């Protein structure tokens, strides 16, 4: 059955009696069961790229073919797990070995056997029932927040021959058996999928609902859609944690995945230490986010293949959760460090350098990865929708976007939340540079906003214009001083500063800004822009008059409104009811209208 | 248990090619197996198998193949890869690149053998770096403080005094003292004068009972230069993670190590990657550098400071570039400061310890320290800006505020950065020097420091 | 219309044949069935990346940026299936579209396409950031066939002269803009400020157009002339005196 090692050169192991192998088939090499992928066939001989250090592999050692290409086990026990990029459970490789290392030659199963879970068979089914890929034949109650929907593997189909009754079961139990063309297939709560193959769908849909982060600058000026593709310039000086933590600890996304592409060893342990301590409110309970995630963490020294696979394991886990009818969201901490793993594997394959050193396929690997996002109709019969949102951080050298991974990423992603070291040095958290940043999903949210927030598109448009006008006016302020500007320009600059400091900026450590709902966000901006339009009305309406209104007169006779506008951030969704917040914001609208009427 | 089976020996040298000797008719060879070549004259040489294929075993000999032949040459195979004999007694001692001692002391009695290649530390088990190591150099400890478990390279350039800084860190380094700490200092491609300097300065200036010193000389054979970093880190892993010791690993010239990966990759006939380095150089430097951090349930901790000669002074070069991607900081040695005879010539502007805010603070050092370092950076930066302004406008055009930043700049280079080769300033002495400079300003000019911290420390 | 779609997560090597299938269908419709076919090829760059991949996989001799040596020929084998043929009323028109990498006009994808195509139309961030839709920058653009597609029997007599003078004034406008950006408006003559005003009025009126607005050539030419009238008649140094006498005063 299995082959034998014939030669080794660095990480590349040639084998013989590999006649029945396939290219990219997964193989165990050596008495220690080292992992590797076939990268050439030469007849009955095959060349295996080994992942771990080959030191001590011997000619004539066993070479067990795995019946699969590189693949992810999917099922119960994903939640709260920490995997590496080739789907090995780092929490269990710790606790089972009692060692601080990943031993060379791990053979621990990725979803831990013998751990029973409460399984409910779908009570609508019977023996002889017809079933297809993506049908939810049962649920596992593995955690209170996330009912794990089991489903028939996408390639499988047939008639139910037996289903397990309600009870406690694990990966070794034959939960389902079905027959097709006279052949029975046995199945388990564990499913397996090729990591480089997309999980198919009934239909990929146009994305049309906001991935609300609870962060004003993001949710208002640069909305990412659920299922959207987006990038963050992940660099130490700009606070990349602020977005990624806020997405996890609040945002409207049923399950989170986080992929360590290849992070610095300490910065990776920072994340793995810190995330378990985060909690989110559900059903008026407080609970650890480890109920709603799995972490695929690779430090820079994990094997080259484990770094380049990292995002493909991540997306595959994320698509499995998408096909349960969840709005999944997935971070990638540095697509640049994944792109280095591409450069290295192509270097070992001796493939020609394309752009700057990277492979020819870097753009295609990025693009065929990002296309795995979106909202979808799931496979199978219960008709559910789900999504995967991809938040791919990039790390351009010196901020230079001409960098191939960064350039191709900005080519493919529809949103860029351009964090900036300048704003972070000024403590302007969330420190998103609104001039550089953009979203291509504005059109796609028109349908949503027209229903729920029909005034908001006007408000967003005015807000960006007001901020852009202040950036142009600042050149005139440098040339000729603030005193030289027109009254309309001065009030625009003052309001743009108010928008910048009391709407874009948000202190996520405070109880009032730890999260910020969308209705709160709209109401705050509505007041600032209603004030702008009425202030500007009084100024322009008193063009050519004997007494002309100016920002200083507005501050003198109604600076209480400016103070109130700045104060609107303090309103608390816990201590204040939604109606109470809306009423206070409506009261500030009435207050400012009467104050403006005292001038014009 | 152990290799209870006897060692084979072959005369089957089917060829010799540069540094390689190709044995043939070999029985079940291992990749990376160590072999003991014997020349026709009986001279022993080590080698390791660099490739295997069927009956062939391509040994890279450690020394050059000078004197090998296809006939009288014989080649013993150990049956095993390179294991270091390791112990706590490797403290107080000096080793060549192969891990043979050279301090006239005996061979090491191993407390265990270890695989030199190591293993990846499990990312669940690595713990965040969270208390400072005192390096004693003020331009490090007051500006770029090192969290124990951080990796932070000293970038330098040819001719700069980075070897004197590396030695000064190796003598001075230790815990903060609000006993169980030991440097492992590993040096590669070292010219014999610089090797004497480390061996002599460490033996003389009090250090040895807390350091292990690995030397690979410039004329030591190039595979021993690849072995030395892994050898040193294997000792650091033993000291930290089995013996609970705190460790600082100092690697003296990662560029001379990159200059070895070139040769070994050429010995495998691999095509050269970016700037002629191996494509996998990122992974290889990661498998050096990430043998570091604290770990769950051990008091032990490995810091690293990779010293790294930027070729042609270029931060874009792969050796500093890849190292900047893998390590949580950088410290720049600067030719501008060295020519001014400032020693140690660390430039505190482009330098950054990314873990500083977790290294330092109340309980870990002193309450003010995190504030003072931000303020010293701001004053040095504004001082440099004003010094450039003076050169444009002439002294009489400077404001009183500018003249303060300029006086601070002058005193900061001549007292904060300047330290000399044997002045072991504690963090406390560095902070007191920080205040001795910052007190030059009016209290209200110190805008990065909190008013409470000023009220508690600005008074003398 | 017939849409051949290959998406970014479909197989990369199928992109090599995707535009060839389109052209084969276009040949059947045009040369066999006399249809007046237009062929749209979308992101020839994402096609060219499949050439670069196949090239690296085969170890073909690399030209600039690692495209195969045959890159020019492969692009010709796509781009030459165009134009009328004797006795057939069909007429394959091709409008390929390509995203230039790092915006670099001299990149091998645009550059080799440049040598093959009948001139090129350029779209620019310097227009798009200013919301000037469609962001077509006239200046770097040319059409090789415009020379014979215009003037009496095709378009109004003035058209060729107007086109050249619009390039002249737009280009001089960019040159005086580049001067103003260093030395200020005080260094510019009244004529240099008129060329700067020309560039501003030109982009706001001639290029700026609604996404559903259709303008005839005649309306485009009249916009051209009402802009050219910004200068005195004699300043229009690309235009002959006969064309000026028939078309300048209106």
């Amino acid at each position: 059955t299995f082959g034998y090692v014939h030669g080794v050169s660095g990480p590349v192991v040639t084998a013989c009696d590999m006649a029945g192998a396939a290219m990219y088939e997964l193989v165990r090499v050596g008495h220690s069961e080292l992992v590797g992928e076939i990268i050439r066939l030469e007849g009955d001989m095959a060349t295996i790229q080994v992942y771990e250090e080959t030191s001590g592999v011997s000619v004539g050692d066993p070479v067990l073919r795995t019946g699969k290409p590189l693949s992810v086990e999917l099922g119960p026990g994903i939640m709260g797990a920490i995997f590496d990029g080739i789907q090995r459970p780092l929490s269990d490789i710790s606790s089972q070995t009692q060692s601080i290392y990943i031993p060379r030659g791990v053979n621990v199963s990725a979803l831990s056997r013998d751990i029973k879970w409460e399984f409910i068979p779908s009570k609508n089914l019977r023996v002889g029932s017809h079933i297809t890929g993506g049908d939810i034949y049962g649920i596992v109650n593995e955690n209170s927040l996330i009912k794990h929907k089991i489903m028939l593997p996408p390639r499988s189909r047939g008639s139910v021959t037996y289903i397990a009754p309600p009870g406690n079961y694990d990966a070794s139990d034959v939960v389902l058996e079905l027959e097709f063309e006279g052949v029975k297939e046995k199945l388990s709560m564990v499913q397996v999928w090729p990591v480089r193959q997309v999980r198919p769908v009934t239909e990929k849909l146009p994305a049309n609902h906001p991935l609300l982060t609870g962060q004003r600058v993001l949710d208002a000026l640069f909305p990412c859609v659920q299922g959207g593709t987006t990038a963050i310039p992940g660099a130490f000086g700009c606070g990349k944690t602020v977005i990624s933590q806020s997405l996890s600890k609040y945002s409207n996304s049923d399950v989170i995945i986080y992929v360590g592409c290849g992070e610095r060893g300490n910065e990776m342990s920072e994340v793995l230490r810190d995330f378990p301590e985060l909690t989110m409110e559900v059903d008026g309970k407080v609970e650890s986010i480890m109920k709603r995630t799995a972490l695929v963490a690779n430090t820079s020294n994990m094997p080259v293949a484990a770094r380049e696979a990292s995002i493909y394991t991540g997306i595959t886990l994320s698509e499995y959760f998408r096909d349960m009818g969840y709005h999944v969201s997935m971070m990638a901490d540095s697509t640049s460090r994944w792109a280095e793993a591409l450069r290295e594997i192509s270097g070992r394959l001796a493939e020609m350098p394309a752009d700057s050193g990277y492979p020819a396929y870097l753009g295609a690997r990025l693009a065929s990865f990002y296309e795995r996002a979106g909202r979808v109709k799931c496979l199978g019969n219960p008709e559910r929708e789900g999504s995967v949102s991809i938040v791919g951080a990039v790390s351009p050298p010196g901020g230079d976007f001409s960098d191939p991974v960064t350039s191709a990423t900005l080519g493919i992603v529809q949103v860029f939340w351009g964090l900036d070291k300048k704003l972070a040095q000024r403590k302007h958290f969330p420190s998103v540079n609104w001039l550089i940043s953009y979203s291509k999903y504005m059109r796609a949210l028109d349908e949503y906003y027209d229903k729920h927030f029909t005034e908001f598109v006007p408000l967003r448009t005015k807000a960006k214009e007001i901020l852009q006008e202040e950036e142009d006016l600042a050149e005139i302020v440098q040339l000729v001083g603030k005193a030289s500007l027109a009254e309309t320009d001065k009030i625009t600059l003052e309001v743009a500063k108010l928008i910048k400091d009391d709407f874009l900026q948000q202190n996520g450590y405070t109880p009032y800004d730890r999260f910020c709902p969308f209705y709160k966000t709209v109401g705050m901006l509505s007041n600032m822009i209603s004030f702008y339009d009425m202030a500007r009305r009084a100024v322009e309406t008193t063009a050519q008059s004997d007494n002309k209104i100016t920002w200083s007169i507005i501050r003198e006779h109604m600076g209480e409104i400016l103070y109130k506008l700045s104060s609107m951030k303090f309103k608390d969704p816990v201590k204040d009811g939604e109606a109470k917040i809306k009423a206070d914001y409506a009261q500030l609208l009435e207050d400012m209208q009467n104050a403006f009427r005292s001038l014009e | 248990n152990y290799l209870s089976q006897p060692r084979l020996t072959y005369k089957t040298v089917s060829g010799v090619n540069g540094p390689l000797v190709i044995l043939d008719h070999v029985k079940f060879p291992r990749y990376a197996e160590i072999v003991h070549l014997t020349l026709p004259d009986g001279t022993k040489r080590s080698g390791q198998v660099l490739e295997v294929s069927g009956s062939k075993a391509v040994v890279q000999v450690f020394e050059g193949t000078s004197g090998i032949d296809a006939k009288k040459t014989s080649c013993e195979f150990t049956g095993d890869i390179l294991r270091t004999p390791v112990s706590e007694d490797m403290l107080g001692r000096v080793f060549n690149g192969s891990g043979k001692p050279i301090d006239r002391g005996p061979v090491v009695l191993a407390e265990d053998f270890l695989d030199i290649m190591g293993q990846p530390i499990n990312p669940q088990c690595r713990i965040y770096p969270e208390e400072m190591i005192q390096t004693g150099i003020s331009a490090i400890d007051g500006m770029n403080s090192i969290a124990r478990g951080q990796k932070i390279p000293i970038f330098s350039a040819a001719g700069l005094p980075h070897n004197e800084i590396a030695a000064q860190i190796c003598r001075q380094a230790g815990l903060v003292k609000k006993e169980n700490f030991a440097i492992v200092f590993a040096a590669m491609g070292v010219n014999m004068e610089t090797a004497r300097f480390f061996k002599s300065d460490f033996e003389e200036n009090g250090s040895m009972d807390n350091v292990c010193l690995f030397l690979n000389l410039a004329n030591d054979p190039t595979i021993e230069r690849i072995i030395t970093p892994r050898l040193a880190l294997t000792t650091a892993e033993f000291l930290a993670y089995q013996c609970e010791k705190h460790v600082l690993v100092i690697l003296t010239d990662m560029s001379s190590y990159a200059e070895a990966l070139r040769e070994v990759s050429a010995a495998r006939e691999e095509v050269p990657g970016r700037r002629g380095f191996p494509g996998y150089m990122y992974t290889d430097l990661a498998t050096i550098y990430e043998r570091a951090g604290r770990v769950e349930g051990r008091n032990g901790s490995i810091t690293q400071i990779p010293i790294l000669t930027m070729p042609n002074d270029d931060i874009t070069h792969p050796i500093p570039d890849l190292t900047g991607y893998i390590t949580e900081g950088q410290i720049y040695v600067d030719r501008q400061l060295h020519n001014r005879q400032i020693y140690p010539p660390i430039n505190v502007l482009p330098s950054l310890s990314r873990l500083m805010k977790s290294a330092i603070g109340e309980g870990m050092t002193r309450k003010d320290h995190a504030d003072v370092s931000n303020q010293l950076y701001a004053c040095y930066a504004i001082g440099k800006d004003v010094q450039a302004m003076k050169a444009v406008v002439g002294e009489e055009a400077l404001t009183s505020d500018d003249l303060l930043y300029l006086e601070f700049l002058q005193k900061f280079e001549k007292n904060f950065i300047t330290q000399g080769p044997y002045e072991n300033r504690t963090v406390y002495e560095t902070l007191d020097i920080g205040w001795q400079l910052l007190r030059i300003f009016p209290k209200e000019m110190l805008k990065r420091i909190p008013q409470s911290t000023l009220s508690e420390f600005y008074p003398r | 219309v017939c849409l051949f779609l290959n998406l970014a997560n479909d197989p990369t090597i199928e992109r090599i044949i995707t535009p060839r299938l389109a052209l084969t269908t276009a040949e059947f419709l045009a040369y066999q069935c006399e249809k007046h076919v237009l062929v749209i090829l979308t992101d020839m760059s994402s096609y060219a990346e499949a050439l670069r991949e196949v090239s690296a996989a085969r170890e073909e001799v690399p030209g600039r940026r690692g495209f195969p040596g045959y890159m020019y020929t492969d692009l010709a084998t796509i781009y030459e299936r165009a134009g009328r043929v004797e006795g057939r009323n069909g007429s394959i028109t091709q409008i390929p579209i390509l995203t230039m990498p790092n915006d670099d006009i001299t990149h091998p994808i645009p550059d080799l396409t440049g040598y093959i195509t009948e001139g090129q139309i350029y779209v620019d961030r310097q227009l798009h950031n200013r919301q000037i839709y469609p962001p077509i920058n006239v200046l770097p653009s040319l059409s090789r066939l415009m020379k014979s597609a215009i003037g009496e029997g095709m378009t109004r007599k003035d058209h060729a002269d107007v086109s050249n003078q619009l390039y002249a004034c737009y280009a001089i406008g960019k040159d005086v803009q580049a001067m103003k950006a260093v030395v200020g408006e005080e260094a510019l003559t009244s004529d240099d400020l008129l060329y700067l005003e020309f560039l501003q009025k030109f982009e706001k009126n001639f290029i700026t157009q609604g996404p559903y607005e259709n303008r005839t050539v005649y309306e485009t030419l009249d916009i051209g002339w009402q802009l050219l009238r910004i200068f005195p008649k004699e300043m229009l140094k690309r235009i002959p005196q006969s064309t000026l006498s028939e078309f300048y005063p209106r």
């Binding site: 001796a350 020609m352 | 050269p272 | 170890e59």
Partner: peptide
Amino acid sequence: FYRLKKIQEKKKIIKEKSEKDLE
């Protein structure tokens, strides 16, 4: 890189042919 890749492939071909010539 390309010139060295072709040199290395030519060497591999020459090695294979040289071993075939042992028969």
